[PDB]
């Protein structure tokens, strides 16, 4: 049933947008995987990369952690622009918790570009700039590290 939800709710927007238009509904924006770290999460994104050809895009988590500051937000915008160039956009990020952090409630210090890439990731992602050619894949180990 997870393969059902996966294929029948991501690959059918890749091939049938009008089938949503003949009925008068709208495909969801944002699909999230979570659970124990052994059930196979990366495998499903790789099965997407195999059995679909609509511009698979991996994105590793702590690669977005930057030191030359200002690069990861630009990089996410580059990723969506590049996958926009090949309009059906299979977009996957692993360890979203490694960039989407619970905003820590403490003083004196703090890495900043996690927040910058977080704000720009949610900006490029959804809400602001909506588009029906974003197919959001993400998988994490834990859920209670994340933001509402």
């Amino acid at each position: 049933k997870q393969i059902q939800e996966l294929v029948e709710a991501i690959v059918l927007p890749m091939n049938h947008k009008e089938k949503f238009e003949n009925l008068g509904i709208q495909p969801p924006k944002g699909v999230l995987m979570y659970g124990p770290p052994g059930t196979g999460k990366t495998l499903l994104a790789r099965a997407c990369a195999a059995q679909t050809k609509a511009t698979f895009l991996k994105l590793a988590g702590p690669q977005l952690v930057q030191m030359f500051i200002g690069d990861g937000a630009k990089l996410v915008r580059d990723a969506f622009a590049l996958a926009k160039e090949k309009a059906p956009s299979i977009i996957f990020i692993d360890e979203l918790d490694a960039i989407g952090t619970k905003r820590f409630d403490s003083e004196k210090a703090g890495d900043r570009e996690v927040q910058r890439t977080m704000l720009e990731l949610l900006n490029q992602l959804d809400g602001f700039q909506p588009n029906t050619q974003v197919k959001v894949i993400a998988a994490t180990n834990r859920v209670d590290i994340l933001d509402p």
């Binding site: 990366t42 991996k58 702590p62 690669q63 952690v65 360890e95 490694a98 590290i145």
Partner: protein, 50 residues
Amino acid sequence: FDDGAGGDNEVQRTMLELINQLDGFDPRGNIKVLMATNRPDTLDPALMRP
């Protein structure tokens, strides 16, 4: 180890970077790694996975 105190976390960022470049999405190859710990119950199940 993280709740509403917000202290030491950057080493965990380094270690998640280690997991990322270590295993999953084209791992090592002809590399054999031995690890050791006196404290197995302080490990992460992002490395306990076979």
